[PDB]
Structure 1
Amino acid sequence: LKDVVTREYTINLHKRLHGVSFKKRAPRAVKEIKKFAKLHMGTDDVRLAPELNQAIWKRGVKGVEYRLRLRISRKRNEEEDAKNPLFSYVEPVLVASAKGLQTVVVEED
């Protein structure tokens, strides 16, 4: 029943994609998010909401947004669970601007 915390973060993807080849900009942005979720939630199994992949790829392979306000939920797998007992789910946050925000724990109701 523990380790089911969901938080909201802003990831500075501009910093992480600095100098990256333009055709590997968006594809690596997905990998950075999984790396970002692994750092915060301790999960190798990280799932991306299809809406989030849309936000990363919204302006093409190369025009990744500088900051993404995102929600990462650490949840449990079921139905003959795999090796990982926990996986982190990342879904986009609908916000006017992703700037100036702080990471907050958001209740899962």
Structure 2
Amino acid sequence: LKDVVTREYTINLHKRLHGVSFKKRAPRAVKEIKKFAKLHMGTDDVRLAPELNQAIWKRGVKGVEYRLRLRISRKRNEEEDAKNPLFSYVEPVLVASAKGLQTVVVEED
């Protein structure tokens, strides 16, 4: 089966952009983060929040923060069934430092 969830993940961007060409580091984060929403909950179709985009590009092509705390909701597809029936929406959770947080199930209401 496939059930709607929404958890809060902290991603280690640093070890994934380690070595990446500066002009390519922010764009790797968008790609690498998509790859991350697919790992947890093999959703395949991934959409990012434009607040997440800002959040990623927050310091230029070159300076992606080492860790990002992410919110990832697996949801139901609407309109002419684009292959799979489920998204992952991804968005930034406000928090001082993204260090030391574990992964957490967000109870939906």
TM exceeding 0.5 = yes
| Secondary structure in 2 matching 1:57 | helix
Gaps of 5+ in 1: none
Q: CA deviation at 1:70?
A: 0.5
Kindly provide the CA deviation profile for residues 42-74 of structure 1, in whole angstroms up to 9, marking residues without a partner as x: 011000000000000000011000000010000
Q: CA deviation at 1:84?
A: 1.1
Map 1:19-58 onto structure 2 (within 5 A). Answer: 19-58=19-58
Count of residue pairs the alignment pairs up: 109
Deviations 1:10-68 (A, max 9, x none): 00000100000000000010001100110001011000000000000000011000000
- Cα-Cα RMSD: 1.2
Map 1:9-88 → 2, pairs under 5 A = 9-88=9-88
Q: Deviations over 1:59-95 (max 9, x none)?
A: 0011000000010000011122210111111010000
CA positional deviation for 1:2: 5.2
Q: Which runs of 5+ in 2 are unaligned?
A: none
**CA distance in 2 between partners of 1:21 and 1:62 (Å):** 8
> What is the alpha-carbon distance in structure 1 between the residues aligned to residue 103 and residue 4 of structure 2?
16
Q: TM-score, normalised by structure 1?
A: 0.96
Normalised TM-score (structure 2): 0.96
**Deviation of 1:3 (Å):** 1.2
Partners of 2:37 and 2:83 in 1: CA distance: 18
- % identical aligned pairs: 100
Cα distance in 2 between the residues matched to 1:59 and 1:28: 14
